[PDB]
Amino acid sequence: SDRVLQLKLGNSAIVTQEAANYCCAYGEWPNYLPDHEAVAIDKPTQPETATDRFYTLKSVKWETGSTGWWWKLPDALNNIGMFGQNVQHHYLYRSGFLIHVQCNATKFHQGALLVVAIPEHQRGAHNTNTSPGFDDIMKGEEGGTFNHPYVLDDGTSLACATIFPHQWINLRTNNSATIVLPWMNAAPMDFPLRHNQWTLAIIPVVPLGTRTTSSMVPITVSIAPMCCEFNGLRHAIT
Amino acid sequence: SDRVLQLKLGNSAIVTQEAANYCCAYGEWPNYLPDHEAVAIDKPTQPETATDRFYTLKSVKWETGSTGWWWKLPDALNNIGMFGQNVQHHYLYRSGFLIHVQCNATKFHQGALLVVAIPEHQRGAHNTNTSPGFDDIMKGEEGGTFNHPYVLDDGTSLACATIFPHQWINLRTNNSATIVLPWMNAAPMDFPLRHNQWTLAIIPVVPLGTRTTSSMVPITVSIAPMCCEFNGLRHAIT
Amino acid sequence: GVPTYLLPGSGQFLTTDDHSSAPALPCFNPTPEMHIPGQVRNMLEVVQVESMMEINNTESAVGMERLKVDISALTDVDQLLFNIPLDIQLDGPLRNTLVGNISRYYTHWSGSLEMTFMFCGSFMAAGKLILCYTPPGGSCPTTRETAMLGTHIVWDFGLQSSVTLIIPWISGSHYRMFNNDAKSTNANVGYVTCFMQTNLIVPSESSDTCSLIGFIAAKDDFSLRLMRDSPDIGQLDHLHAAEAAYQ
Amino acid sequence: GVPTYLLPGSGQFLTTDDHSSAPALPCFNPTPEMHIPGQVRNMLEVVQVESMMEINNTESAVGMERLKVDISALTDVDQLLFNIPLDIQLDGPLRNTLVGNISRYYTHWSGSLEMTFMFCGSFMAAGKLILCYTPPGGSCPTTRETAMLGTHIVWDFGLQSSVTLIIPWISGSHYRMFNNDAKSTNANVGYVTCFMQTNLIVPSESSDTCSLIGFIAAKDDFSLRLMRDSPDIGQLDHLHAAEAAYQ
Amino acid sequence: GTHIVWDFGLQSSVTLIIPWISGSHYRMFNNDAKSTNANVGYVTCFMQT
Amino acid sequence: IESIIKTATDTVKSEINAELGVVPSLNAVETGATSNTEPEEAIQTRTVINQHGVSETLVENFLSRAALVSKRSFEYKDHTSSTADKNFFKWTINTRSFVQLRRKLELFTYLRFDAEITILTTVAVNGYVGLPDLTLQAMFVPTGALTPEKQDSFHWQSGSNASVFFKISDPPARITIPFMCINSAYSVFYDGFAGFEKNGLYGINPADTIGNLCVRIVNEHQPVGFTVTVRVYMKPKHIKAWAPRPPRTLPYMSIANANYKGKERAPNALSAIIGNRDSVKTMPHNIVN
Amino acid sequence: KWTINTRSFVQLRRKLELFTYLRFDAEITILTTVAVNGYVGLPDLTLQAMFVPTGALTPEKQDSFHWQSGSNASVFFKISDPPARITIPFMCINSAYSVFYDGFAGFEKNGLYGINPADTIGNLCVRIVNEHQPVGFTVTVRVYMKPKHI
Amino acid sequence: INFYKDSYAASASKQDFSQDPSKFTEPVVEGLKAAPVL
Amino acid sequence: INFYKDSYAASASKQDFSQDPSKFTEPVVEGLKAAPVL
Ligand SMILES: CC(C)Oc1ccc(C(=O)Nc2cccc3c(-c4ccc(CN)s4)ccnc23)cc1
């Protein structure tokens, strides 16, 4: 049962043979906006399979000195495929996300990644009064690296980060993690270029180690937007 | 339907072949004073067709430099026909009004008149602390001219004057305007020589223009008092 | 007697409080009510009445001239004619309007706007205009094929003098704020632009230049919230004769 | 009028009082409620979520390194691996945990704790551990055959990565206190100790050293009482830009 | 495009379906491979990890 | 048609149209009707169930908040040598002196309401001795009643005038005055003259005359002087309003009239109400990235 | 003038920051205390607090006509009174306040990071209504907030 | 709470939700259609 | 005791004893068993 999984969305599918169940954030599932919660009165476009499909980001190398990695949503996808085109042509966006994180190694490797989805991960800067600037936050498809993962770069606590939706990749146990994120905002829709609802954080709480011959151990991130809606059609900001 | 109109009151009738519907101010129609609102206990005279008929004022010439024109009611009619005689012999008056404004030009002319009936158009003076005097206000049959139509001569706003009962004469569209005014006062009757309930304002928001040979383009005002009642018979002030 | 204790806020004068208070004139009979035309019961009835926009708010437009926009025949296709700033909080063509003035007594707003334009050229004048609303996020469009991607109406001059562009309520939040930071994501509405769809075409005996009057009103989906002192009026001194009331 | 008299406490401002008070904005309509994921209604829901213990709170453990314990193959039987101080009031591995941080807003506590340990060695690594809870009264046990007399679980590494030790509520009183006197009979919980039950055994190609992550949560028999200011935060000065709010 | 992410495991083998995506009912076995009546597109394999 | 409106209207979903003879976006402004084009007719819409209340724009709520109508400072001292408000003042009651209330009231032609009056008193020592807890008397003097000449005149015996006595240590004194016009509504504007001769005041309806507020300190003077300031607040309540008006744009000049000058340059100049922009093609706060 | 915020005193800040979104009404208690400048007794002054929403004009002077408060909510209170108290409703333009905001406040890139524009309350303006005395005093105003209906 | 004998002493009456905006927006004698208005 | 006309003026509402801790403790799509979890 819990160990094998197939995810199919649009023209894309993923199989894993070493899942550890999967997380639905706060027990919710993505849905479209109902009429009794709607604000914008124009008829939304709902592209379905053109947007609601897995996009794969660039892989990152797991190293002995890694501090961990982060990507902000929708920012990381705002330039990718038909999701990106709808983002650029529309004032308002709403979606959930399906996050699938991939990392495999041999039975002689050890290491543990915390895979945590943080809502409203407002970052702090270290050792300054000046707030983080636009280019510190808006990393896009490449994402960022943690400066001080021990405090989640926000004066807080890695140890208590399990309060957020999460899984672990413990290389002994499993080689993938899956989190389903609902829409998570104070408004029913948002401008996708100035606010990120979710941050995916991948942090190596136990470092990668082995005594076999070393290999590159990549971590790969695949994200499917779910139930995408767009409102306020205009020219592309792009 | 909406383009042609005939108005018949007493021995007088007006036809127009280019109306733009007509306005009933605040959706009311003129009526006589009912017993449950009456104050003065003497039996009123109700002259009917002797008073409730169109009186035509002197025409004004529309010019390139015109600021617009105004007439106060009942003041403009207080010396005309049997309406004027009843005004002069009676302490108290009440009526509605039917206002019909006339202006025609060729299909090569352009221009737009705002025709607005203002209740209690208390005028200001420009650039002085001294209030307007009697001869600034009481223009009679001739009416007055706007000094600063942009602020309606009362420190206010032509742009927001559409909050009052109004029509436009847009020379492309129509050549007459009609407004029906009910009795509009805080008291059920009034002394007609010291208070004006209504001011007719005609303001050329778009100026008269053409490249045909020029002609005199007059604006003509016809007003019918409606449901006239008079109380407190005495000698004529006259 | 009844045992009692006073709470915080005892003895305060709150200007928005709502209590009964002692009648100074006992047994006074007010004047009977009389029917008066034009009773208003909600201020939203006033903002639904369309009123002229001051679109030509330019130097050398004086007084009444600021309430109209003059259009001429062009020799280049699809040219921009004018744009309208949609800021009700910052000074602009919408401020001195019935919807504008009443809304500036409030802080929060929601709902659709209508702009109506009346063509006031001669009967022989012809033309087509495109009026575009662009939702916020980028710069105001300067070309027709950019503005055409937004919400728009193509207006042909004819027997009906006037066209409406609806500005639909398109917003992430339930309300926007009348914020002095016009570029705030909680405040910016976007832009209205007018382009030639064809051209203004007139015969020799018509005037070569024609005017638009623009009007704005709220629709009945419109709502206002959080009352405030309007910045439209103020005084630095006592008014003339205000002192004489003490003399 | 009604005869009345004021009681003691009339006019006081008690910060935990519970009265209605005058609405400053009459007829204001708040924004409609919208469903948001993750509503919390009792703080006990948060303390039931397991969070990492800082067991390796030693000098030369920096940052993330403090959240794991490294285990190696030994050549002596039944050796002690680590102990966990159970003081939530005094600084120790439990303080910066979800149960810890929320509990430090309160003075009294009752109920069972769970510690979960995840083994993060390679698949080829094998071993058995014994995890012991000792009820209070004496010193922390330093030998396995002493610790074995308390409450314990013997953990075999396998396909299931993680074991729970329950710390059951064993107390004379209904509640304990978060007391700075850790040796008080109203406060001391006792000890958790980990020993080798067998040995960590790994092949040459696995890493010779492996890590445990320890987690703690409350069970749903857990209760907190008497709210207090948490000693986890404080300020000696105004914050940066707090003054600028007056400028 | 259309894809499957394959994790090696106890099940040895993965299927990629090439679905019939065509404007016409049929394609031709045409020696002009670049003809719009003939070209099917491409299959590519990349490292996911 | 009259209806009970508690919330903003719902939006219904709409389809593509393309119907001959139907042109809901065309209008005729010349009729004087406002555009009836609905959003569902201009664009394709979704369904929106709209829960926004409209109660904060009720006319009762818009006007019924307390605003300053009168503010007078006077010397509380031995006045034998003064030439001045000698421990009392008289105020002729009006709503035209403070512009925030004035502009709101002048949005309407007729208003009927009762007036909740709050009297706030504050004291400062003249240039310290502590502040005396004085007793004040406010007395309402209707039309044709005699106003007090002195702090201690027998007019203050108030046999039939309404008086309120209040301490500085009290909460603000509060009373309600009924709607007291001799007409069914107050005339906020009056296009008329107050008397039967030609010299009467323009612009004030005689029917709306309230009277005088006379305020004294009841205490005899102390050996040292103080300055006492009285503030009067009025809240309209039980309001009816008729015939809404274009708002005031130019600064008020006088309490006696609507006279106007404008600011020296825009905003709110007589030549230009809105501040200028470089052209009708210039967007002043244009977003650029 | 004070620009209203919850971030200045750390005990309340840390408790609020345990959550991502909060919806509540704010019970506000205003406590005033006075000391003589370096004795004459303490004056029983009247204070005016006025709430100035976004886009309303703030007072420039103790006696500016902004204090006439035609449409702003004001409370007048004495130092001898119990603390002044009022409730402010939940006033966000969203269904909840954003305690944290991973976003930027404006459509250009230079807007503030980390503050949701939707949660702007406004300004609290407090004056002494009394004219000055011949001698100086120091007046301290303390504002307390209690969330309710959370 | 109102123990005064005069009804004008009462607190404000904020319950009148009747509107008729057509008396300002549509004072035309023949009603508009949803259809050429002229 | 609440004589104010606005319901937000009322005292605090301390009566909501509904909990669902599983949305934080058990957000797994297939529920745990009391039984090997993997
Ligand atoms: C002494 C005490 C027992 O009685 C009183 C009596 C009156 C006052 C006082 O200032 N009232 C007032 C101050 C300001 C205005 C008014 C109004 C207005 C309604 C419409 C207007 C336009 N013209 S004006 C009516 C009644 N009052 C008013 C204070 C105390």
Ligand SMILES: CC(C)Oc1ccc(C(=O)Nc2cccc3c(-c4ccc(CN)s4)ccnc23)cc1
């Ligand atoms: C003058 C009198 C009549 O009205 C007032 C009005 C306001 C005040 C005052 O300080 N309120 C307040 C002080 C501190 C915080 C707030 C909040 C917040 C909720 C979430 C926040 C995060 N951003 S902030 C909301 C409303 N208020 C607040 C005092 C008196």
